[PDB]
A and B are shown apart, each in its own frame.
Chain A
Amino acid sequence: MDVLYSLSKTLKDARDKIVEGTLYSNVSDLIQQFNQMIITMNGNEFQTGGIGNLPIRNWNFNFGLLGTTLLNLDANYVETARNTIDYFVDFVDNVCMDEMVRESQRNGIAPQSDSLRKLSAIKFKRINFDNSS
Chain B
Amino acid sequence: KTKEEHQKEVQYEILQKTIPTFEPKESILKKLEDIKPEQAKAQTKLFRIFEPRQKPIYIANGEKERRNRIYWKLKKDTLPDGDYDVREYFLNLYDQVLTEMPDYLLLKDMAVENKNSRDAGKVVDSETASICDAIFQDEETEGAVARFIAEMRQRVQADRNVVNYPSILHPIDYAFNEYFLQHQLVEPLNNDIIFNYIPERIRNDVNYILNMDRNLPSTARYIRPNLLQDRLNLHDNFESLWDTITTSNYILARSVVPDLKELVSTEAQIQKMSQDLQLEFLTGINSQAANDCFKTLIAAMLSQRTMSLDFVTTNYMSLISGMWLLTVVPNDMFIRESLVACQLAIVNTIIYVAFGMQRMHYRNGDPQTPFQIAEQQIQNFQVANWLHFVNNNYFRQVVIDGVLNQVLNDNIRNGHVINQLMEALMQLSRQQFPTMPVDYKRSIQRGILLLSNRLGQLVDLTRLLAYSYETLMACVTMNMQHVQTLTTEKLQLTSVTSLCMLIGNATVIPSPQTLFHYYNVNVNFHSNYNERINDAVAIITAANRLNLYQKKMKAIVEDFLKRLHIFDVAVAPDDQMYRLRDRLRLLPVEVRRLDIFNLILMAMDQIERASDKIAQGVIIAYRDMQLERDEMYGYVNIARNLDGFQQINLEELMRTGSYAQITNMLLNNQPVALVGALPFVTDSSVISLIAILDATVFAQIVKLRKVDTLKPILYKINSDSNDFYLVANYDWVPISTTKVYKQVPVQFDFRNSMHMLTSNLTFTVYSDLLAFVSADTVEPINAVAFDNMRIMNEL
Contact = CB atoms under 8 A, between A and B. Distances in A.
B588 A71 contact: no
Nearest to A35: B586
A71 B545 contact: yes
B613 interface: no
Interface in A31-77: 32, 35, 65, 68-71
Contacts of A28: 588
A70 B586 contact: no
Contacts of A71: 544-545, 547
Given A70-B544, A71-B545, A65 B586 contact: yes
Most buried by B among A35, A65, A69, A70: A69
A69 B541 contact: yes
Contacts of A35: 586
A30 to B, nearest CB: 12
A71 B545 CA distance: 5
Contacts, number: 16
B544 A69 contact: yes
Nearest to A24: B545
B545 A68 contact: no
B585 interface: yes
Contacts of A68: 585-586
A90 to B, nearest CB: 26
Nearest to A65: B586
A24 B541 CA distance: 11
Interface string B540-561: 1100110100000000000000
A33 B461 CA distance: 50
Nearest to B594: A25
A65 B544 CA distance: 17
Interface residues of B, number: 8
Contacts of B540: 69
A74 to B, nearest CB: 12
Contacts of A32: 588
Contacts of B586: 35, 65, 68
A69 B547 CA distance: 9
A65 B582 CA distance: 11
Interface string A10-42: 000000000000001000100010010000000
Nearest to B545: A71
Interface in A54-112: 65, 68-71
Contacts of A24: 545
A28 B586 CA distance: 10
Interface in B579-638: 585-586, 588
Contacts of B547: 71
Nearest to B601: A71
B585 A69 contact: yes
Contacts of B544: 69-71
A76 to B, nearest CB: 14
B691 to A, nearest CB: 45
A32 B588 CA distance: 8
Contacts of B541: 69
Nearest to A67: B585
Contacts of B588: 28, 32
A54 B540 CA distance: 49
A87 to B, nearest CB: 21
Contacts of A65: 586
A70 B545 CA distance: 6
Interface string B557-588: 00000000000000000000000000001101
A82 B541 CA distance: 24
Nearest to A68: B586
A35 B545 CA distance: 20
B533 to A, nearest CB: 15
Nearest to A28: B588
Interface in B525-547: 540-541, 544-545, 547
A69 B588 CA distance: 10
Interface in B380-415: none
A26 B588 CA distance: 13
B60 to A, nearest CB: 42
B554 to A, nearest CB: 15
Interface of A: 24, 28, 32, 35, 65, 68-71
- Please name the 9 residue pairs, one residue from A and one from B, whose CB atoms are nearest each other, closest first: A69-B544, A71-B545, A68-B586, A69-B585, A32-B588, A68-B585, A28-B588, A65-B586, A35-B586
Given A28-B588, A68-B586, A70-B544, 13 more contacts: A24-B545, A32-B588, A35-B586, A65-B586, A68-B585, A69-B540, A69-B541, A69-B544, A69-B585, A70-B545, A71-B544, A71-B545, A71-B547
16 contacts: A24-B545, A28-B588, A32-B588, A35-B586, A65-B586, A68-B585, A68-B586, A69-B540, A69-B541, A69-B544, A69-B585, A70-B544, A70-B545, A71-B544, A71-B545, A71-B547
